[PDB]
Design a protein around this ligand. Structure first.
Ligand SMILES: *[C@@H]1O[C@H](CO[C@@H]2O[C@@H](C)[C@@H](O)[C@@H](O)[C@@H]2O)[C@@H](O[C@@H]2O[C@H](CO)[C@@H](O)[C@H](O)[C@H]2NC(C)=O)[C@H](O)[C@H]1NC(C)=O
Length: 288
């Protein structure tokens, strides 16, 4: 009895070996033990079954668009009841689709991200594996059979911080219906929110009276801060100051412009403020 295996909707071939062909009538039966081919003639009105070869050595039939209901034993016997012989058992497989990946809720630095991965239909039951940066994560899985096909789900949960924002997680599904070594994969991009940062970088290390200084405020955060605020301790920004987004330009600096300058930004997880100490040296000061 030949073990024959097809992917759902694919093509299988079933062959009856006959030995010293008498010329008598060959009955081929399906898994319900209903006559499917009477000698060379199809006995059931199913256009997916086609006689392919009736030679002195074998009778071969082809099945197109294989369905789960086609599974079971197929038989070949002489109408004279020489023997009830099973000549094949058909098994129909179902490969997983690319898995569906979801997240429980918005992940926030300091908290957890919780992901699920689901394959709704596979046969045999797909195996689900989680990867991050080539390294496998340990998840938790469950599945069940719904008729002849299995639904399988897996979940993983881990702490995140801002370094994980934008990181890629892979869920990978495998089963025997896929060619050896191959996989069905789904990528998921982490979105981790975090409180902002602010840092000032100045266009010069040493500032002299007469200089034009540019301060640049580098900001991070998720969500992205919408607005940079520039300010100064104790008193107002110099009259010539030009605060345009992330840059503060201080032209024509004079001694009285010295002081502490700040840039600040915010998102829904908090504020960040950077401070810059501005020293303005007269032309004769010895600094370096
Ligand atoms: C049952 O069928 C076999 C197979 O041949 C069938 O008939 C062929 C002529 C052709 O129409 C094919 O499509 C069929 O599969 C019969 O064996 C054949 O007998 C015929 C006699 O006309 C001759 O064509 C072939 O040489 C034979 N082929 C083989 C492989 O033996 C067989 O006689 C049929 N049996 C009965 C009881 O009717």
């Amino acid at each position: 009895t030949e073990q024959v295996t097809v992917a759902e909707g694919g093509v299988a071939e079933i062959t009856c070996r006959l030995h010293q062909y008498d010329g008598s009538i060959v009955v081929i039966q399906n898994p319900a033990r209903q006559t499917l081919f009477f000698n060379g003639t199809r006995a059931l009105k199913d256009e997916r079954f086609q006689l392919e070869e009736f030679s002195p050595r074998r009778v071969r039939i082809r099945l197109s668009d294989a369905r789960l209901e086609d599974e079971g034993g197929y038989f070949c016997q002489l109408y004279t009841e020489d023997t009830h012989h099973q000549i094949a058992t058909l098994t129909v497989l179902v490969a997983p689709e690319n898995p569906v990946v979801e997240v429980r809720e918005q992940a926030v630095e300091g908290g957890e991200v919780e992901l699920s991965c689901l394959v709704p239909r596979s046969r045999p039951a797909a195996v689900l594996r989680w990867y991050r940066d080539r390294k496998e994560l340990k998840g938790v899985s469950s599945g069940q059979e719904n008729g002849k096909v299995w639904s399988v789900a897996s979940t993983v949960r881990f702490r995140v911080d801002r370094k994980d924002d934008g990181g890629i997680v892979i869920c990978e599904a495998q089963n025997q219906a896929l060619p050896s070594g191959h996989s069905k994969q789904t990528q998921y991009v982490l979105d981790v929110q975090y409180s902002p940062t602010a840092r000032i970088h100045a266009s010069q290390a040493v500032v002299r009276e007469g200089d034009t200084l540019v301060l640049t405020c580098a900001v991070t955060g998720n969500p992205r801060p919408n607005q940079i605020r520039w300010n100064r301790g104790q008193e107002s920004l110099p009259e010539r100051a030009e605060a345009v987004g992330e840059t503060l330009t201080l032209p024509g600096l004079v001694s009285a412009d010295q002081g502490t300058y700040t840039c600040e930004a915010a998102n829904k997880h908090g504020h960040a403020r950077a401070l810059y100490v501005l020293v303005v040296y007269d032309p004769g000061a010895v600094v370096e």
